[model samples]
Target: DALNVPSTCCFTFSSKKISLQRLKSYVITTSRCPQKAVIFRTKLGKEICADPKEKWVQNYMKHLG
Candidate 1:
């Protein structure tokens, strides 16, 4: 099977579902493949990346503010 390049990636924020304000922090990370994106660390100390261009990501970013 071939890889599916999607408008959104599988990385999710489910485990870190505390009120956005109470969360620690988030930042954009850049790389050759995924390009520019936002990554937030989970309570379990794992990093999850979401595409900044995706609607869900934009909404989540705003919710965090």
Candidate 2:
């Protein structure tokens, strides 16, 4: 069976935040990581890294659900 792909660890987050409407989905980096991060996938097929500790990222993950 195929499972969702986990995002690779990113050293830092983006300077600007992305709109929720522009994001198609997200993948998380965890377990082995120093800290978890949210990897947001845009509709155009690009990914942006957002540190999970950020306030907007918490809302982003919660809102996505």
Candidate 3:
């Protein structure tokens, strides 16, 4: 996937310009790096990664409050 519509894809604003390709690149580049990718789940329990294919995304945001 590309960065054209990250928000619509259920990604956070911090992830707005990021794409799956970019993520894959980051993973590959940092495969051996000491740093790790961790997600701090919100009160509603959403994950950091985007997967808009699931119906729960929009629903989650809608019912977040």
Best-matching candidate per lDDT: 2
Best by TM-score: 2
| Candidates arranged by lDDT, highest first | 2, 1, 3
- Each model's TM-score, in the order given? 0.50, 0.75, 0.25
lDDT of 1 by residue, 1-65 (tens): 99966353334434434444434556776354345767765556666766677776677787665
Clash-forming residue pairs, model 2: none
Q: Where does candidate 2 stray beyond 4 Å?
A: 1-7
| Candidate 3 residue-wise lDDT, 1-65, digit = tens | 76553221222323442322222111111234333332224444444543333344333434442
Kindly indicate the candidate among 1 and 3 with the higher lDDT: 1
Lowest summed lDDT over 10 consecutive residues: which window, candidate 3?
Answer: 21-30
Where does the lowest 10-residue lDDT sum fall in candidate 2? 1-10
- For residue 56, what is the lDDT in candidate 1? 64
Q: What digit string (tens of lDDT, one per residue) describes model 2 on residues 5-55?
A: 774787888989889889888889766888777899999999899988889
- Residue 8 displacement in candidate 3 (angstroms): 15
User: Model-by-model lDDT, in order?
Assistant: 0.59, 0.84, 0.33
lDDT of 3 at 39: 26
TM-score of 2: 0.75
